[model samples]
Target: VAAERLEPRVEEKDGYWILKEQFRKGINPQEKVKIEKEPMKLFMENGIEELAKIPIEEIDQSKLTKDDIDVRLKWLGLFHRRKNQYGRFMMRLKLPNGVTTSAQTRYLASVIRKYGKEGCADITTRQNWQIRGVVLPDVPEILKGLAEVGLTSLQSGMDNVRNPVGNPLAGIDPEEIVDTRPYTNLLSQFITGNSRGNPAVSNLPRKWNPCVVGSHDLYEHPHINDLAYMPATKDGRFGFNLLVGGFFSAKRCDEAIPLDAWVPADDVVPVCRAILEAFRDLGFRGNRQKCRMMWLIDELGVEGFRAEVEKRMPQQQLERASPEDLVQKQWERRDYLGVHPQKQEGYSFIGLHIPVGRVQADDMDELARLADEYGSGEIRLTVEQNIIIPNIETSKIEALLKEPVLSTFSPDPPILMKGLVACTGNQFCGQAIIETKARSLKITEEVQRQVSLTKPVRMHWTGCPNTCAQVQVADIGFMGCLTRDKNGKTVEGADVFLGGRIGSDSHLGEVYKKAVPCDDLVPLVVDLLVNNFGAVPR
Candidate 1:
């Protein structure tokens, strides 16, 4: 007859606690007094929340040190920078699994129009967005507004994991082993601080990237990150095959290698925490340049690294992968551009080409609004530096297609426009050997004017081998470098690459030639694509 109270459940597994229980022994008064005096006082004095609340502009500009600026800048997503050019910072926003809403897109566009220079936003090879020409004073407002919209730039620039990329078309893709959107969001929240909130993760050697590939539409390479997950089957259940220590930088390090771990889809959260915790605890703090995830991997061989991860993993399922699944086979890495069919009947997906990944703030706002009005609020970003709006009803497709913005940046773009990717070269990144985005677009336009192509050809340009733009993964990859001319003069030149492919089968392009000037590259690449990939002379 009496009401029964529900009891909480508690289980201890692998050194992790499901619930906390009070100690039978009473606390010592002296120990409590000591803790209250030191730890409690220290915690109260730290005041992280109050510090986080201070408006960027309100912060003392004189005390507005470079360290503070860097922290604030990342909160807005701008990473790479031209040395001494505080006027312009590269901001890369975290698009959860590269998914966006029309409202968010439009909001971003508005942000660019009001604050960004020249109304431009760039879609990156890593399924993220970048804004340039941001004033130092505007960062606070920009960050505040972005956080208001559920967006962030935290951990995007430095040694922490950059945006976690996943299959661009997740839920709508028929071939997906799992809808990675949810998992991507889950993992991002877990690391960046969930509802409980997390302090900004700092003190890392270099930037890191983590990408999840649900299906093979967007090729995710194992040798390109601190960690990567490829879809796999384990013990008759679908899960992820893990890879670790993948990164690209000007400083040459051996390529990122695969880890011998395979985790079930459900267990990915714990696995991510375990790996990040390991890095946070042991990653080198002495030299910023040498502190990439790869350095740690090098210091600890694969077996040794696995031992470390196992130590941190608390009661989670993990298994060593079989040799058959561990084979190093060629993988694809191409951007999805143009219109394609969706899994849903009477619906299709379109990949809109954003030249060199730049879009206006106004344009972003318009895009977000349009996505909300015409179809699902969801948006997908491609590795080729483009945007894909998926799940439109068949009947409404035509009306949506006729919009002026769609035509300007075509869903089915011109050959030259379809595959152009460029890094923030001399204008922003100090390490750049040559001007990148502008030169790349100019070259593409010249080639398009001189010749027409029957099919799309991949062309990527990077200021340096930091490979932020992933030049090596294009059908025609160009790495910006300096070369001596016949007169023994150093000139702007780029290393050429050819034969890269992505999808079902992926492979990196081979370096076709050494440092050729940008002027000469037009003719060389035009000839190569026209002759080899079937482009027609205009």
Candidate 2:
């Protein structure tokens, strides 16, 4: 039956193709919802407006199914809030390559600000913004406003290619071989159909991530992306070497492996489309736990998968990438957290660490103001959840550093504080088992109070096993869970993961300990910091 379930087939139904029914049997409930109705159709057919017409207070009494409210709406970027924050939604915006303008930032900030304390925003690990506490009735207005700012939340969630990540210093980095902006822009446009949403690659077996990094790899988490294009060249002509199948999920984690194929810059989009088509048609749907692209690649073998990708790319054949084809060895992991000189003379980019990636309306507005005043009215978000203001004149650096916003979102933070990353915990996300951002900040502060460290420890906190913070790629990782206290009362806890390395050699962390309550975590983490990371007790 397992083998039978793995049989490759997709049937067209109501304008979208769905997996064969026998293959979908006993699959996750979410899969059934998707199969029943095309998720995009909800938006295309005014279902969202119909949903919005229902009062938030009485939404539960309405006819919307659990799957419709929680699952399908994600295709439109409206994530249903947890029960505690019921009636509100968290909207993930589309900011391809983590680039946004001052205008877009202010518009999004106003959207969040109107809800007062209920509203906030976070810079996600994918280098995109997620606005919280959005009411149902305002979704259409918000969507329209986002479109006005040249943004959209469409296909920003579930079974779709996430906001594409690129070099944080794409056009500005002095050492970068290729400016990733054009390619990333085109790739994102292809996937999202010019930011209006494209159904072509939307219904994959699960969420797929793609990264397009230049030769220097300023983008840190490329190895964790489902698809990555690492800059390379053939006979002096620049292109990209393809990596496929890297992902982190509750059940499995794996780094992307080289597909041994390289393509010219022009072919990146079509190559991406071809791979998406292949995965959508043949990727596993029987078990949600094992449905990541790597598993499909595992089933088909890398060479076999490459052949299929090749068959789909009929316009241009892929070239086997020789070791020499790579323009440079992957650079060491460096979050562009301080002022750095741009390739363009006399210009600099300042990378600011937004604590725990959280920013209220004021912070957003301040950032927009600073970007307009000092930079070229643009901001770039890093996977580390920090923002970089590029195109600052060299002469303006001293004055820009003195700005009040710089004090809170500092470019120069304590070493321990610099590497801290956190996901939206119980505060916003329903799937999160623990409150992460606050807990993460608390633990780091407590540890800093207890110990002193010369080097920054890359500590990541995810609210749950979903690993939205990409904890697997951090030096010290915490995955949220539930545990019992000494008196046997249930409490928030974490499963400690350690030794995850990134940069030139990328590897996911391993589970170091299981089910340690949050209360008892600081000491263990302090000890780990002291013993392993050369921290000295103050």
Candidate 3:
């Protein structure tokens, strides 16, 4: 399949270098859409103007095409909800380093406040925020609102690089080697072109995830991103070594392998730029399912790909990677829940476990209020679907802990609940086959009630095989599927996955059992908990 993909040569045509035959024959439906026009042009050419004028009830009657609703608008970060949720959309916000301010949170709350039960937000696994129940008419206003609070959603979906993830604790973690905040912010700025969108990375064969994180732990799951930079020291100077070609997809899944290159902290963005450009110009576009970075790496051999990236970097020479043992320290996973002293003398950061990453408008409004009152007006989110309020004075921790909101989003949740993570299910995303967030919450609560354990058990749930919740990294994972009940009726079910490990020994788990109906899932989970994780009956 890799060899069969057409690799067109880049040539100058009308003052632009491009794959000459890219649009002559559309490789796929999405490629055909790009052949018609650049996706970013939808924003640059005021496509939203027409969309904003169409009323919600009249969306179906409007002149918009199917691709316009399902494929194109995603470039602007407007994901049109499924048919059951027609006329509404989910707007994903880019929060570099999982950082958001009280002002931004309040504005986001207002954006989703009017839809009643449907209105809400979710802290996505990428350490970003996505607001649901957004209407087309209000999109311009929402974009304006986002800009007012110093945020942007440009180039956030589709083939563009998804939100650049980093250590949620970033500068606040007491033992971090490099702060990571500056690097993450810079990486995001480069990709988004200072929040206005850059054409350089606006078009790729497939979606990409790039993570920049500290050396303390695999907090951002560098193993699963297309490009990752982990902090390392070279001859007494602090920098990062590169890892490339990691991804999870319907067709395949693989951890990132060393790029065998190291660079100073300041060079992170440049190195990323070189690789992204190489991908944009040279990546295979024939097969949608097989277009991930790893496929391209397999096509051009790892060392050969390294030379391609080096050719794009004329200003600096690439350095060989540091020894693996010296580059990384022992792995220790911490959820960052509860109050933990910061590197600063009197300040601390408090993490709140937001169950399944679901929060209503009122919930966010309250969180905004608490951020302003208790901390530095900053709220940080984690890939584990949790929140952190940083820079709170040590003396105020007790009072902050007593807040009613904290009672619900507890700092010290049960062991099983603490590690729970889920993805948007059929309720919102079109690809999901079964319900996820709600089921994950219900199952975890029931399991916590039925069993007791001394150690944390990470459980990740994905609504489908797409692996949005990263089931591969959890101790116990569930991937949604369909099965028959004893009475012979088709019912929702999950493919149980186990043996996945995180931190220093990070590796993907495999499906232990297939198509176990949801009705029997709890008891089976209890048995597995007792046998594998040492869970005891309460």
Candidate 4:
């Protein structure tokens, strides 16, 4: 019976060709045809279900009328609003290759002011901005308005693949392997229209994140995605080395694994499509929580998964990358804040530290206006919760540096403010075990005032194990928790993780101490840093 089902066969159904080479040897020709079509059914059912439900007509009208659809969408968990009591809906706008013009920023800022709870946004670790406090009723109008300004929030959440992060300073990075902006743009467009946006990508049990790392040194570890591509040279020609299955979530049972494939730089878009197709077909859909691309890799193994992708590729000219091509221990990420020279002579990128990635509406407007006034109107966001305004002329550097926002946030911010990354904790997220942002900021200030530090220290705080803030990647990582102290009294606190590093050689931090109260954390952290690393005068 098993051997009969393994016979080779092909059939066409619903305008798609399905090849069945398993579990159908002794069956009738028609039955074999049905089996071939069955696999096609999987693709069809998965694709049609999502595509058919798209509120395209509703969305189209909402865009035209600037209607309040966010309210309704919020009920469906499609959007959120910013308020002291509400989880500020963080709108993840898709910017291909992380490029945005001054005009675009101004327009986005305007929308944020008009419809968002406040005109505030944070640059995400994924090389994109996550706008906060959007009004529930204003989301549809906001989305429509953003579309007018050349932006989209499509497929940013849920089971879809997320924004493809790339080098924050793609074009400006002098040491980059490729400009990456063009390819990033190309891939973004393709995915929105072809892959994740296509009905085919909605069936996975969980969400996926894809990123392209063009520059070797800048930005967070690009390798930490469901799919990632690092620049490489093939026979002296520039290309990309591909990896797969990088992600972080509560459901992950195995550590993130990389796909074993390599492709030319030009083939990046197709490779993305092929991977999506394979995942859509092979990924588990019965249980949505366990259905990430990584799970599929685990089930199929690298060789089997690679073979599946190859079957979908239009061309098979990929090569295996040399072991040296992979980013190994030794390359660690650095804070891209402060003034730095760019590839463009007489121009540079300046990083502005935003405390815990939070800003007000009026401040955001001012930043947009400043971007247009002093620089190219182009802004870059670093994974370290900071912003970079690029393309400023050498002559304007001093003046630009002195701007009010720059002075406040400052290119040379205090050490604590410079490296702190915290997620919205109990304030918004229902799952947050404890407050994060407020605690993190407060701790940093207290620690700074208590102990002087010569160098910056990386500290991250997450509200829970979800690690939305990637707490595990920090030099000092803290995950929110509630625990009983030595006296058996419950207290809000965090589990400390230490020794984590990023850049070239990246590793997750280890749990150093458990259930330390928020109040005691500053002094304890200060003491540890002072004893281990150099400390400054209190």
Candidate 5:
């Protein structure tokens, strides 16, 4: 990107701002951007309906520029891929806090079964779905289906602020201090309100990650985002304490440092708006590598950043939390697997762990059946690749457990298996160098056979350095690598990492082993868990 010196990567390129091409080497691409005529403007003028009229087969690569065909679609929660992977689009949906009604779930699944590939849908690490194998002509129908179900993909991708996840157990959890749904919904609606038109966050430096968590144990890691607001009791008052700048990427990962500000529940949206305005006014736009909000806080200094936020706020003054105010937290441990008593009398919620979050179409549709047949007509999906079926009667728990889908997506999977998570690997993502989901499954099954554990071990497998599975923050993290086999065929391998923590004390795990062969992983991991971690054969 050329800022002023104007060196072009590709002609007429603009990222967040008008690029007057610049220099590099020492300059990180993350910090640069060009928003001269926001790309979304093109979508607004032509209308998304125009793309609906064009079929996938009719798309001419020459007329279809990479910026629009590929980049802009992300704004609509669609990702276009290379020809090797069907040349179709991956459609992502916005499911705020992973809560969905039974009918909506089935309706969404029906649309996917109608057009998506065999697997149909994937549950994202951020608690959303990415339906695969879709064509250009399918866009209109998909949007119509989504609208009917009260779901929207607008603002799901690109520089827009991503979904804000709350405790999936919100309102039902016996231990939660606050209900984060209203605040989460408020912020999501504020940002996504004009998504069909020109949304406010049209040309952000990069995607802004925002999460609100109110569980006493902080079910959503208090620092897995650029800005995370966690439960706090300040001098006997319940509210949230802000953590700013936490981010993870291939090159850098940082736990959010406290902004030292606490706000009452009602101020959540305004505070969010203020933070965004500060980001908009003061964030870096000269390098893409440093485009995230962390860099902006760094450049402005925390005090300066805080000052700007207060400046943008309707109420100029913000309070700081004292040492006595407690904030809750989580890492490898909080899978909702198994039955739990709901705060609501005579009811409970069952947590079903869906392996690697890659759910089948039939299973997807079946969840609604189980939800309606056993409990309330609603379901909740946890960030842990599992789900919560709330409002089940105490008497009917046994009957619900007998559902056939439980055999595959179980409430009590093997100890380690309960905590396993993997991202879509080479099977879908182009940036991935190795396949991961199936391999992670193989390791979990084999490892479970050889080792039993007293404690839950959260293991994350990410096929690439994009950090989709967020392996760096897991108790055990595996970053997949490509290596040549003895016969000279490129095969998958993993770099193992250990000791990451969340909740009470949050920290990133460090690499423990490098490039371990794929075939040797299960045994190696089994030995590590059994010998060093006190696990043994079942």
Candidate 6:
């Protein structure tokens, strides 16, 4: 590692910045995506009603610049950067741990079918969902529809505090050391302010990501967020250890470092609030590339940062603990893609594999039906883009498994295919330089049939360097780009990443192949699987 520098650089591109032109390089996710808060301010000033009424063609030609539309639409959870191709917006929802009731699922499905072309809903890596092909005119009405279903997209995107994540089992798992739902919800409420009128944290130096995991397992990736709370204990009191500064990208990835601060079970929310306030007040804002909470942590040293948080919250902040006090080392990882017994006796949960996490409009209704008919009307989405239906009577497990939707969204997918993941590729994203979904699907099928492995290989395909699919966290990771073909012609390809040690040491993968053309990727990956990962062709 290079010597730490206290100076913040004004130079950045694609979230990377050079300190003194060569001392060190680091990533700033906000600098790249949260380009500016000006456009967002315009959105807040100019009501959504006016923008929604304007026709697409006229709006483009009007004084409302493309940048303005981009920021405004995001507040509504709409992506318009690539609107020209589909003539529609992409809507993303903020669902912490991907929790949804049966009614919410049914309502969302109907909304997608009515306004979205082909009615496609994709479960995201963040344990969220995004619907494609949303027309601008329907946004206002859709917003109302969403509100009726008890969903809100506030601060879900752009330069704001994002959805707070937790373990999918949360309070339900017997092995979990803590139940994080209350803490997660409280933190989210604090950040989002619970209303548009009170936009306290809608604009920060950049976006802030916070995660809390109640279980011993770091399944929610405690070390990969700007702020995190994982199971910990000090003096035999069960609480959480605060970890800070974790983030990943094509430029640089760093696992979160402990602040040495430990908070009791009841104090997680106040401690988090203090951390957020300190980050907002003390973090660098001059350069977007140096705007993440990690940047602040680097500049202030862990102790200095902790002092600021403590001072901000006064007596609410907890005392420090030795790193040895943390309980996350015993992480028992679960993909949650199979049947499992719940903590409550005579009850169970079924995990279903939604291929690449894509569900059709009709499938949402069926999912809701299964949840309501056979289980609790509750569904949980995992970081892996899969869903779990909990609170089913033990006797109903077989019936739930027999649902016709299970044929496509299988409970028992092939071992290799079980871990497959992909982002919104060229189909809906403007930033994507290459198509991903079909190729990734093909890769999974061929790899599963052609190779055999002792354990499941976690795979991810992200269409861009933004790390939406978080390729760096997977055992076999592919990042979309263009590379030279055998004939030296420019063609679609991917950058390969390997050895991601998630759920254990929480290490990010490093680049193995800078760029390999799509044509050769299959063979190259297959060979890597066999040679390095102990896979043998069937």
Task: Score each candidate by Cα lDDT.
Answer: 0.65, 0.84, 0.84, 0.66, 0.75, 0.74
* Model 5, CA-based lDDT: 0.75
What tens-digit string does per-residue lDDT give for candidate 2 at 455-519?
Answer: 76899999988898887888889999999999999999999999888765667789999999999
The top-ranked prediction according to TM-score is 3
lDDT of 1 by residue, 387-492 (tens): 8888777777778789888877687777778778888788767778899999999998988888877675778889887777776567888899898777878799
List the candidates' TM-scores in order.
0.81, 0.94, 0.95, 0.82, 0.90, 0.89
Kindly report which residue stretches of model 4 are placed more than 4 angstroms away from their true locations once superposed: 1-77, 81-89, 115-119, 135-137, 194-197, 251-258, 287-289, 326-332, 485-489
lDDT of 4: 0.66
Deviation from truth (RMSD, Å), model 3:
2.4
Per-residue lDDT of 394-499 in model 4, one digit per residue for the tens? Answer: 7888788767777677788787788888886876567789988778888888888888786668889989888888876787889898987678888999999887
Q: Pairing residues by index, what is the TM-score of model 5?
A: 0.90
Clashes (N, CA, C under 3 Å) per candidate = 29, 0, 0, 20, 35, 0
Model 6: residue 88 alpha-carbon error in angstroms: 1.7
Candidate 4 vs candidate 6, TM-score winner: 6
Preferred candidate (lDDT higher): 5 or 6: 5
Off by over 4 Å in 5: 1-37, 41-46, 55-60, 116-119, 194-198, 328-335, 486-489
Higher-lDDT candidate of 4 and 6: 6
Q: Which stretches of candidate 6 lie over 4 Å from their true place?
A: 1-46, 62-65, 83-86, 116-118, 195-198, 316-318, 322-328
Count of clashing pairs, candidate 5:
35
Candidate 6, lDDT over the whole model: 0.74
Better of 2 and 4 by lDDT: 2
Candidate 2 stretches greater than 4 Å from native: 1-8, 11-15, 20-27, 57-59, 62-66, 215-218, 325-327
Model 1 gets an lDDT of: 0.65
User: Clashing residue pairs in candidate 3, if any?
Assistant: none
How far residue 385's Cα lies from its native spot in candidate 5, in Å, is: 1.2
Candidate 3 lDDT over 1-538, as tens digits, reads: 3532434434444332345674445476676676565667667666777767865556555434556766778888999885658888899877888999999999999988988877889999999999999878788888878988899898788888899898887887777767778888998899887877777677788899999877467788888999989777787877888999999987788999999998887789889988887787778777788888899889888987887788778564888887652325465677689999999999999999999999999999999999999998999999988999999999999899889998899999998888999999988988898999989889888988999997788999999989999998889999999999999999999999998887767889999999999888899999999998999998
Q: Please give the range of 10 consecutive residues that has the lowest summed lDDT in model 2.
A: 1-10
